[PDB]
Coordinates of all heavy atoms in Angstrom, one line a residue:
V135 N 8.5 -2.9 7.6 CA 7.2 -3.0 7.0 C 6.4 -4.1 7.6 O 5.2 -4.2 7.5
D136 N 7.2 -5.1 8.2 CA 6.6 -6.2 8.9 C 6.0 -5.7 10.1 O 5.0 -6.2 10.5
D137 N 6.6 -4.7 10.8 CA 5.9 -4.1 12.0 C 4.7 -3.4 11.6 O 3.7 -3.4 12.3
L138 N 4.7 -2.7 10.4 CA 3.5 -1.9 10.0 C 2.4 -2.8 9.4 O 1.2 -2.4 9.6
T139 N 2.7 -3.9 8.8 CA 1.7 -4.9 8.4 C 1.1 -5.6 9.6 O -0.1 -5.9 9.6
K140 N 1.9 -5.7 10.7 CA 1.4 -6.2 11.9 C 0.5 -5.2 12.6 O -0.4 -5.6 13.4
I141 N 0.7 -3.9 12.4 CA 0.0 -2.9 13.1 C -1.2 -2.5 12.4 O -2.2 -2.0 13.0
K142 N -1.3 -2.7 11.1 CA -2.5 -2.5 10.3 C -2.5 -3.6 9.3 O -1.5 -3.7 8.6
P143 N -3.5 -4.4 9.1 CA -3.6 -5.2 7.9 C -4.0 -4.4 6.7 O -4.2 -4.9 5.6
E144 N -4.3 -3.1 6.9 CA -4.5 -2.1 5.9 C -3.4 -2.1 4.9 O -3.7 -1.8 3.7
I145 N -2.1 -2.3 5.3 CA -1.0 -2.4 4.4 C -1.2 -3.4 3.3 O -1.2 -3.0 2.1
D146 N -1.4 -4.6 3.7 CA -1.7 -5.7 2.7 C -2.9 -5.5 1.9 O -3.0 -5.8 0.7
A147 N -4.0 -4.9 2.5 CA -5.2 -4.6 1.9 C -5.1 -3.7 0.8 O -5.6 -3.9 -0.3
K148 N -4.4 -2.6 1.0 CA -4.1 -1.6 0.0 C -3.2 -2.1 -1.1 O -3.4 -1.7 -2.2
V149 N -2.2 -2.9 -0.8 CA -1.2 -3.4 -1.7 C -1.9 -4.3 -2.7 O -1.7 -4.2 -3.9
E150 N -2.8 -5.2 -2.2 CA -3.6 -6.1 -3.0 C -4.6 -5.3 -3.9 O -4.8 -5.7 -5.0
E151 N -5.2 -4.3 -3.3 CA -6.2 -3.5 -4.0 C -5.6 -2.7 -5.1 O -6.2 -2.6 -6.1
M152 N -4.3 -2.3 -4.9 CA -3.5 -1.6 -5.9 C -3.1 -2.5 -7.1 O -3.0 -2.1 -8.2
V153 N -2.9 -3.8 -6.8 CA -2.5 -4.8 -7.8 C -3.8 -5.1 -8.6 O -3.7 -5.1 -9.9
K154 N -4.9 -5.1 -8.0 CA -6.2 -5.2 -8.6 C -6.5 -4.0 -9.5 O -7.2 -4.1 -10.5
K155 N -6.1 -2.8 -9.0 CA -6.3 -1.6 -9.7 C -5.5 -1.5 -10.9 O -6.0 -0.9 -11.9
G156 N -4.3 -2.1 -11.0 CA -3.5 -2.0 -12.2 C -2.8 -0.7 -12.3 O -2.6 -0.2 -13.4
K157 N -2.3 -0.3 -11.1 CA -1.5 0.9 -11.0 C -0.5 0.6 -9.9 O -0.7 -0.5 -9.3
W158 N 0.5 1.4 -9.7 CA 1.6 1.1 -8.8 C 2.2 2.4 -8.4 O 3.2 2.4 -7.8
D159 N 1.5 3.5 -8.8 CA 1.9 4.8 -8.3 C 1.0 5.2 -7.2 O -0.2 5.1 -7.2
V160 N 1.7 5.5 -6.0 CA 1.1 6.0 -4.8 C 1.6 7.4 -4.7 O 2.8 7.6 -4.7
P161 N 0.8 8.5 -4.7 CA 1.2 9.8 -4.6 C 1.4 10.2 -3.2 O 0.5 10.8 -2.6
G162 N 2.5 9.7 -2.6 CA 2.8 9.9 -1.2 C 4.2 9.4 -1.0 O 4.9 9.9 -0.1
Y163 N 4.6 8.6 -2.0 CA 5.9 8.0 -2.1 C 6.8 9.1 -2.7 O 8.0 9.1 -2.5
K164 N 6.1 10.1 -3.3 CA 6.8 11.1 -4.1 C 6.2 12.4 -3.6 O 6.9 13.4 -3.8
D165 N 5.1 12.4 -2.9 CA 4.4 13.6 -2.5 C 5.2 14.2 -1.4 O 5.2 15.5 -1.3
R166 N 5.8 13.4 -0.5 CA 6.6 14.0 0.5 C 7.7 13.1 0.8 O 8.8 13.6 1.1

């Protein structure tokens, strides 16, 4: 995930945004 955080700062952006959102379900972790 260190390689993916390096390849997109989108990783950290979404993680932080999700913490702000007050949810922790991503329908993709389970969707496939």
